[PDB]
Amino acid sequence: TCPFYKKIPGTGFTVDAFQYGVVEGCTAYFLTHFHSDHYAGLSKHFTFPVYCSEITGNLLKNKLHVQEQYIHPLPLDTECIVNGVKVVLLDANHCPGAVMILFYLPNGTVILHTGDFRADPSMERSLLADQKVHMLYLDTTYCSPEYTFPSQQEVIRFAINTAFEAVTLNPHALVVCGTYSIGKEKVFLAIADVLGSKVGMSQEKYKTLQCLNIPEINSLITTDMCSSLVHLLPMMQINFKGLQSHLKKCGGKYNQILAFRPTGWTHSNKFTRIADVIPQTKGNISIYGIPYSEHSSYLEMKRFVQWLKPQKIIPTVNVGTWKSRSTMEKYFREWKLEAGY
Ligand code: NI
């Protein structure tokens, strides 16, 4: 049965709660974003109202084949009424179409659900600043002090300069970027822009990108692999065997590959800066691991919460074990005592 952390008190609303069949009481199911864990259980067979962003709506319609009658897209940054209750969607700074949801309860309680988010100081000057928030449903993916990582901009700069240097040294080099869902599109779009190229990709991947309301998208991407010197491939193929295999398939038009694996955090964040990063190499193939995160670091998450001063915090990530919940509670109390709420 549907856990209390996916339920919104004193409404019949739920959030990211599609895997438990019919939730008793629920009149409206909210989807923060189009990642499989959050959408899990939704399909063309679902027949209840789904509320979400316009991008998330495009994806449900075209990829999942959810029938149009059940998709209720809502605009960003606008007060809307859903089943008699005032709501706002805000940009989560996660993947394309990802939202936080602000719920104004009839009794006067205000609740923020972050979905998945990368906390940022621009969120301190949104509609969030206009009133007190009593309860926060928080993306605790990286809620521990060892989780640091560079800015997205630092990582992109590094990728751009690296790719440009390699292709100017060898204009028969191919650049490859690994991918498994939506998110992190700026990595491959910024590399292509510096090389003057479109990004080549499979039919299924192109169809996904064509849903994302990216301006001038037709001028940036293509299914013609031949005509393009940046290719997307599944993350599972970003290894020496997979990359040599792909290189054979391209028909002798390239003689070298530079590949990037965008990742979350891995243990080598604790010593290395972005400038010190060096690839793994076997013959004419090099693989760079670059820590491009679309979740809050510890410092970013702490800042956000200390600004917001919630009366109660409800974690939505790593809640399955008592040790994790206990550890997280410890950090929330520290934050509260330091800040004075
Ligand atoms: Ni996500």
UniProtKB/Swiss-Prot annotation:
Induction: During mitosis. The mRNA encoding this protein contains an internal ribosome entry site (IRES) in its 5'-UTR. This 5'-UTR generally suppresses translation while specifically promoting expression during mitosis, when cap-dependent translation may be impaired. GO terms for biological process: cell division; double-strand break repair via nonhomologous end joining; interstrand cross-link repair. Keywords: Cell cycle, Cell division, DNA damage, DNA repair, Hydrolase, Isopeptide bond, Metal-binding, Mitosis, Nucleus, Phosphoprotein, Ubl conjugation, Zinc, Zinc-finger. Expressed in brain, heart, kidney, liver, pancreas, placenta and skeletal muscle. Changing H295A: Impaired nuclear focus formation, reduced interaction with PIAS and increased sensitivity to cisplatin. Changing D139N: Impaired nuclear focus formation, reduced interaction with PIAS and increased sensitivity to cisplatin. The keyword Transferase does not apply. It is found in: Nucleus. Its main location: nucleus. One of its GO terms (molecular function) is 5'-3' DNA exonuclease activity. GO terms for cellular component: fibrillar center; nucleoplasm. Belongs to the DNA repair metallo-beta-lactamase (DRMBL) family. Binds constitutively to TP53BP1. Binds CDC27, which is itself a component of the anaphase promoting complex (APC). Binds PIAS1. May be required for DNA interstrand cross-link repair. Also required for checkpoint mediated cell cycle arrest in early prophase in response to mitotic spindle poisons. Possesses beta-lactamase activity, catalyzing the hydrolysis of penicillin G and nitrocefin. Exhibits no activity towards other beta-lactam antibiotic classes including cephalosporins (cefotaxime) and carbapenems (imipenem). This is DNA cross-link repair 1A protein. The lineage of its organism: Eukaryota, Metazoa, Chordata, Craniata, Vertebrata.
